[PDB]
Design a protein around this ligand. Structure first.
Ligand SMILES: C=C1/C(=C\C=C2/CCC[C@@]3(C)[C@H]2CC[C@@H]3[C@]2(C)C[C@@H](CC(C)(C)O)CO2)C[C@@H](O)C[C@@H]1O
Length: 254
């Protein structure tokens, strides 16, 4: 019913987050050619044995995820209030949300045209088959694609997109956080900004219960996070796997 206007502070928060995202997310994916090259072994049969023996796409995807974690760290540091947190809590939040923010931000390259993450020519077009070539199974891939399509269909404004990533990172219910109260205060400031923005800037019918749908996606991410963690564990058992990853990836998921 009531549609209060965005306060000057809330307008500032949105501007800061849009700027932060524009500085940390290259929509041309021009740095991707710097990663170890993607390699696609012939695996039409989806052989787990072959996939683990080769892990052909792991070096490239590990580099992409590692690169993305660095960008997420940069984005997070610009979130209003994040700097008010202790270094210890900042690191806990970054490590726990990293994979979730990667899944969220990747929605920008994801396309329902062919259900792929298109970041350039054929070489930089990622499909579910590339994820299997990196050692992951359908238990993660299936819900991941469903998540991407569900998020796509929300038709989020960039303002809503960056606020969702910020809310995801600044979550007081992450294991190991010390000052949950401060984190919750910061998240509430971001959540109220999002709710206010939706109610006065998002036209119908796409605004109908949009906030609730966005919050549900954060729950979905928790599930994907746990599943990715389980599979990363299996992946780590493969001899020589560490060399195909990166020090940052090893720390965040190890
Ligand atoms: C990263 C990003 C992009 C795409 C994301 C993808 C396409 C390739 C496979 C990934 C990156 C998937 C998200 C999760 C999925 C994943 C399930 C995670 C990886 C898991 C490892 C590291 C092997 O354990 C393998 O595949 C491209 C761009 O929009 C920036 C964004 O920042």
């Amino acid at each position: 019913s009531l549609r209060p206007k965005l306060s000057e502070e809330q307008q500032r928060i949105i501007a800061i987050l849009l700027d932060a995202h524009h500085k940390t997310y290259d929509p041309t994916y021009s740095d991707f050619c710097q990663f170890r090259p993607p390699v696609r072994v012939n695996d039409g049969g989806g052989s787990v044995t072959l996939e683990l023996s080769q892990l052909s796409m792991l070096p490239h995807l590990a580099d992409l995820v590692s690169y993305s974690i660095q960008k997420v760290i940069g984005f997070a540091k610009m979130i209003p209030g994040f700097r008010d947190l202790t270094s210890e809590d900042q690191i806990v939040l970054l490590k726990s949300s990293a994979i979730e923010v990667i899944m969220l931000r990747s929605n920008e390259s994801f396309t329902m045209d062919d259900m792929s993450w298109t970041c350039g020519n054929q070489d930089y077009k990622y499909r579910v088959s590339d994820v299997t070539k990196a050692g992951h199974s359908l238990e993660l891939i299936e819900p991941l694609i469903k998540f991407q399509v569900g998020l796509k269909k929300l038709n989020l404004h960039e303002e809503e997109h960056v606020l969702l990533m910020a809310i995801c990172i600044v979550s007081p219910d992450r294991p190991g956080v010390q000052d949950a109260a401060l984190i919750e205060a910061i998240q509430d400031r971001l959540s109220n900004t999002l709710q206010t923005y939706i109610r006065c800037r998002h036209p119908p019918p796409g605004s109908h219960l949009l906030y609730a749908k966005m919050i549900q996606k954060l729950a979905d991410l928790r599930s994907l996070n746990e599943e990715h963690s389980k599979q990363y564990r299996c992946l780590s058992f493969q001899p020589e796997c560490s060399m195909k990853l990166t020090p940052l990836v090893l720390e965040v998921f190890g």
